[PDB]
Amino acid sequence: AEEEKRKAEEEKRKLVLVIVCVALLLDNMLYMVIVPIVPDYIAPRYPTESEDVKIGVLFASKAILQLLVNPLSGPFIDRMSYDVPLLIGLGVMFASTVLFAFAEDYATLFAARSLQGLGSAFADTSGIAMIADKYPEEPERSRALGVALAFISFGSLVAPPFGGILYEFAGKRVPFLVLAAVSLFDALLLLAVAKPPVGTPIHRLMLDPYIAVVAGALTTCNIPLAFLEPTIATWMKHTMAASEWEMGMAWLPAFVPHVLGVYLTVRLAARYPHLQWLYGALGLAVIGASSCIVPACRSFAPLVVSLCGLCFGIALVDTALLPTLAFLVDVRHVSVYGSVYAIADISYSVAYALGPIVAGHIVHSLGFEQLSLGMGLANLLYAPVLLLLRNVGL
Ligand SMILES: CCS(=O)(=O)c1cccnc1-c1nc2cc(C(F)(F)F)cnc2n1C
């Protein structure tokens, strides 16, 4: 009897995990392959440039619009379900992707990136929130958030070089239309599978110092990849004259230590459940080590190992603090997971919204090693700030 319904429920819950993680994979593929495509119109590819604030405000339009939406879309995920705002996010992401494949101007690209911001808020917060919801127990919550962040890192690291070599071979019409078709197939498959209490407000999560220090951790761990992603792809030619094939391929061996860091902290959170603050702090420590060591890496292979240490550190901090964030709102607040991952994406959003607007300007004014040592100083001075979470078992 009951074994059949239980294995069917675990089957459908694993299917929802796979469909949500593939949704996050394809969505981050969108956000990180439109970046080498945008400067080619407005007048072996590598994503970013460092010039033209008018284009940089387009690159940060996604992050500033999710920064403006998900404080209002946090309680939207709390009031309604998770599957309906995930469908709203994937629907506006389909509309965004066919708006990329539809036109080529500045205003339409700005509108498509803004719709990617709206879909980032809705779809990304709903996806991470229902991965936290459908895995209430802690060693499966950490492992499912690990698979989530592993496919997020897949779509954000190994997807931009192949998206670039599809833009150089096929173009922009056919790849974005078929990727929007695969995204609508994923959304309709989650409609076929999923079939879609009072909640705490978003103000009261900021008054919780534990949620506030995890939000500061996510801001300060995202801020090195925030300021270094529009910047390294012009520091290459200034430093060591990196080839264009070895240009956007620099984040491509940074996925393997990301998934090794994810696996390492899933192991060290299933073995040590109430010691995730130490792996968040150690993640921030190796973040500050990598950001301190990047301008010392004047050859290509040490730059690759420094950026893979950077993705290793963001993997440790994200996979050791996003289960801590849901566990923390579970044991200290009501057990609704939308607002607290809206706070997580607020941290993500303020990082990637201050990145492409003023990052290139403060590199052109101060320098590159000054910015890198500033962020490494921030992370070496913020890794002993995660010590406040030592009483999460108490
Ligand atoms: C090194 C981390 S990464 O995955 O490889 C990555 C690489 C390049 C650009 N961005 C990301 C990236 N980091 C995220 C963290 C979160 C969350 F806060 F939820 F943990 C959500 N989305 C993320 N994305 C898309």
Please tell me what DSSP assigns to residue 391: G
Domain that holds residue 276: 2-391
Best residue among 153, 223, 229, 343 to mutate for probing ligand 1, ranked by most atoms within 8 Å of CB: 153
For 222, how many CA atoms within 13 A lie in the half-sphere containing its CB?
A: 23
Residue-wise DSSP of 262-274: HHHHHHHHHSSTT
| Cα(341) to centroid(ligand 1), Å | 13
Taking a C-beta distance cutoff of 8 angstroms, is the pair 217, 317 a contact?
Answer: yes
262 lines ligand 1 (CB under 6 A): no
Listed residue (53, 38, 26, 48) closest to 108, CA to CA: 38
218 lines ligand 1 (CB under 6 A): yes
Residue-wise DSSP of 260-303: HHHHHHHHHHHSSTT-HHHHHHHHHHHHHHHHHHGGG--SHHHH
111 lines ligand 1 (CB under 6 A): no
Q: Whose CA is nearest to atom 5 of ligand 1?
A: 153
Best residue among 21, 26, 28 to mutate for probing ligand 1, ranked by most atoms within 8 Å of CB: 28
Buried b (16+ CB within 10 A) or exposed e, 294-304: bbebeebeebb
Please tell me what DSSP assigns to residue 335: S
| Distance, CA of 387 to CA of 213 (rounded, Å) | 10
For 285, how many CA atoms within 13 A lie in the half-sphere containing its CB?
A: 11
In sequence order, the 6+-apart residues with CB closer than 8 A to the CB of 14 are none
Return the ∠ at Cα 179 (arms to 173 and 183), rounded to 5°.
140
| Distance, CA of 245 to CA of 66 (rounded, Å) | 32
Which run of H or of E encompasses 85? helix 83-100
Within 10 A of 291 (CB to CB), how many other CB atoms are there? 28
In sequence order, the 6+-apart residues with CB closer than 8 A to the CB of 392 are 210, 274, 276, 277, 324, 327, 328, 331
Class of residue 13 by CB neighbours under 10 A (exposed 0-12, middle 13-18, buried 19+): middle
Residues in the chain: 394
Please tell me what DSSP assigns to residue 124: I
Taking a C-beta distance cutoff of 8 angstroms, is the pair 134, 11 a contact?
Answer: no
- The dihedral built from the CA positions of residue 103, 19, 254 and 324, taken in this order, carries a sign that is positive
| Distance, CA of 236 to CA of 238 (rounded, Å) | 5
Q: Whose CA is nearest to atom 10 of ligand 1?
A: 156
314 lines ligand 1 (CB under 6 A): yes
Q: Whose CA is nearest to atom 17 of ligand 1?
A: 318
3-state SS, 22-60, equals: HHHHHHHHHHHHCCCCHHHHCCCCCCCCCCCHHHHHHHC
Within 10 A of 102 (CB to CB), how many other CB atoms are there? 14
Listed residue (42, 65, 45) closest to 175, CA to CA: 45
225 lines ligand 1 (CB under 6 A): yes
| Cα(153) to centroid(ligand 1), Å | 6
In sequence order, the 6+-apart residues with CB closer than 8 A to the CB of 213 are 385, 386, 388, 389
Return the ∠ at Cα 105 (arms to 31 and 352), rounded to 5°.
30
Number of compact structural domains in the chain: 1
| Distance, CA of 52 to CA of 56 (rounded, Å) | 6
Taking a C-beta distance cutoff of 8 angstroms, is the pair 355, 60 a contact?
Answer: yes
Question: Which value in Å is the resolution of this experimental model?
Answer: 3.4
Positions of chain breaks in the chain, given as the residue before each break (C to N > 2.5 Å) = 43, 196
What is the CATH classification number for the domain harbouring 199?
A: 1.20.1250.20
In sequence order, the 6+-apart residues with CB closer than 8 A to the CB of 70 are 121, 122, 125, 342, 345, 346, 349
Method of elucidation: cryo-EM
| Cα(267) to centroid(ligand 1), Å | 20
312 lines ligand 1 (CB under 6 A): no
Listed residue (282, 306, 314) closest to 372, CA to CA: 306
Taking a C-beta distance cutoff of 8 angstroms, is the pair 98, 180 a contact?
Answer: yes
